[PDB]
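pasting Metallopeptidase for the record, 883 residues
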Amino acid sequence: ATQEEILDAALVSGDSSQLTDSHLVALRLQQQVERIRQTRTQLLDGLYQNLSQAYDPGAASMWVLPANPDNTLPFLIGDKGRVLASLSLEAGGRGLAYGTNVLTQLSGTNAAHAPLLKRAVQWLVNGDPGAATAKDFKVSVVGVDKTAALNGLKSAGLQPADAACNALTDASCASTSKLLVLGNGASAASLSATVRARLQAGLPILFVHTNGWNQSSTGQQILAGLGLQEGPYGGNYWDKDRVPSSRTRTRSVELGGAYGQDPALVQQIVDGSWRTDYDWSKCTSYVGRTTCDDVPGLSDFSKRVDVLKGALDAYNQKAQNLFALPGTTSLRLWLLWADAVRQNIRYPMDKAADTARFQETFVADAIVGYVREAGAAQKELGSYAGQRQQSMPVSGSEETLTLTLPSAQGFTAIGRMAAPGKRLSIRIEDAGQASLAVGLNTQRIGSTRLWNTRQYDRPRFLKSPDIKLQANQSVALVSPYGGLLQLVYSGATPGQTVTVKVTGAASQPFLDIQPGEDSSQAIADFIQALDADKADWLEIRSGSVEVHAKVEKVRGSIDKDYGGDVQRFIRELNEVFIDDAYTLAGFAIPNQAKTPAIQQECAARGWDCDSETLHKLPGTQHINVDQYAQCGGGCSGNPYDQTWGLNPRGWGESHELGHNLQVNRLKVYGGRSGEISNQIFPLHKDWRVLREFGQNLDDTRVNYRNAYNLIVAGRAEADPLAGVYKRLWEDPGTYALNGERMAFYTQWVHYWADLKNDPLQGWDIWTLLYLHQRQVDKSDWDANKAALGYGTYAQRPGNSGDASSTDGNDNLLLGLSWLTQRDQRPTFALWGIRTSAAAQAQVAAYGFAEQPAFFYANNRTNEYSTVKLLDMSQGSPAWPFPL
Ligand SMILES: [Zn+2]
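structre below
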């Protein structure tokens, strides 16, 4: 078969598998775009002639936009670019929609529009804007006032007669009526479908939005029947856009022909006239990531490409197959062109060395249609994947999976992959009240480093749009890239399940630790899948953490850090990394009782330390392990990105996990502890690792010595609390005084260890503070405040994260005083930490003996046997370790 014959077939089926000649497709697209422009401009020129185009719908109006570009078009575009009315040629019919009821303004504010409206109505009735209507032409008016509408039409020089019947819902009235006028009061079965069917059968429709700047679902449905869409929330309220009387024929004809179309970009594609002289010296670099926002001309190019992506991604998001909807040829050609381009992409490309390949690929990467029955794999997957991903076996039968949702909103790995160019079918069942979508992959967009020299080596958009699903309705997908399937959810009940059915999917290595079940078999099966080595990507689900990882990166870590010992790697991931953090935070972990000391303290305080209501595990934290990251070689977020691999014992792993587990009421001076109060997680892990294993990791993180220097100097000032504050907490820098501020947090660990007379118990104070804080945050205030040491508070305290707030300082003071049964105000003052009068009154009410100011000093972070206690109440001792 010729490429010509392949293209013709693929326009019907969507099957681009054998289509490689992108130039041929681009030539067809060129003629299609030109056909659309010729049709539009001829119609708009006939409508406008030299009549005034003045049209002012006021603030109390909505915008009304084309939705299908092939058969709809703007009619009135204001100076600010807002579409105020649109024309429809959908299904071979004739429709016109305004964003306000212009018919009742033809004697007033829009008297000047009457001549033009007359031509538009001539075009509706006759199909020719210069053909006069017959006297007494029958007009049916539905959902807006009949008399006022007919009087409006008369005001424009027309002589309508009342059809006296409902042409929206009565097929016989539709057949004799010359025009149907609609507003938002209409009633009908299947309103969009009914409107479409009337239009297709030849009833001309004039729609007027009757709800001002308010949106209308009836209007949205009518407009969808015309192939139009309502503009966004607020309507014309802020912009107050209008067409001025100075608007020329030529200008509006040009704007209307160009709207939502890019003939210049099509021509650049066809001719290969990609820009050879972008000024790349204007790019800049931030932590190794190059961006180019200030390269002249580049942002405008990128925004034009975004229009195309936006257009196709609306179909993706709605789970609509473009090839199943009539009147979508332009978009079909764009998509088939991009699929053809994907057959020829080769990596890597550089922005200066390979301008034509780089720029054409830049466009093609933005145009991916996932909802289809067939289509092509991209031939080269570069730094993303390789031959394994391309050759993964797929299941011919339906697979059934049950997923648990740990919070109301987020996404979770389904445990299967789309294979490149291979159809899969998916559906969800048993979803309760959750709203669901399916997605592919988890990459963040900064992880395609296309502006770095020679690093355009994968697709721009490896993560698909979220593809909405309805319960019990199957959707067919084809990805050019393959990818890890994700269930995206919102409005869920924590702990609920969902059933996923999928046919045609591949099975990546997938480790699904069962919350409180034996896992030695799951581990063995995962290892066996890794040993078979048929995949480029894997996933791991363990508690509230999910890892999405390039296989080669995980192998690298197992080899480097574990000498090839996969078993120990996995067990440490689960226990030393994940379980360590969530246990430190005191969450209710299924089938894992609290330690005896935590149990006993909680019991002695009469606390709820075990309910799911207060202490359920939080929403999933995702981790991406890949060749590239969103920012730097590793980036905060959810997911957070790592490019080195995945080390269960690593500082960064736990530092980032810790950000997910931070709470404002345990931060000193809000944001000043933004990179402090999360460090308990990696510090605890390192203390544990030294004791159990003997590796001594990050042993100089906590800078007790320099904290001491700053405290000793600041407390010599006239206001000693302010003096310390200035030297320790004032600096707003992201990582300012990181080591010194950490030494505050560990004071309480050493203190608690001494209080309990047990070195192993020291970190329990943080677990207790977390348990206490979640009760403060969520328990019934009146019933629980006495038990939480907050009896003097009429209302729950605030949760501000601002550095100027005392909400964290206060809760730390109260929690620590309450748990230790000593008034801790002198040590809080020593550290420069101010508290509110309310919190001070509350500590006074406890009736506890003061703990005089103290300081725990050490010359190592991880080894606590050497820590020394300094009494600070009478003066400042010497630093007690030799320099
Ligand atoms: Zn951080």
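The first strand starts at residue 64 and ends at 66.
The first helix runs from residue 3 to 13.
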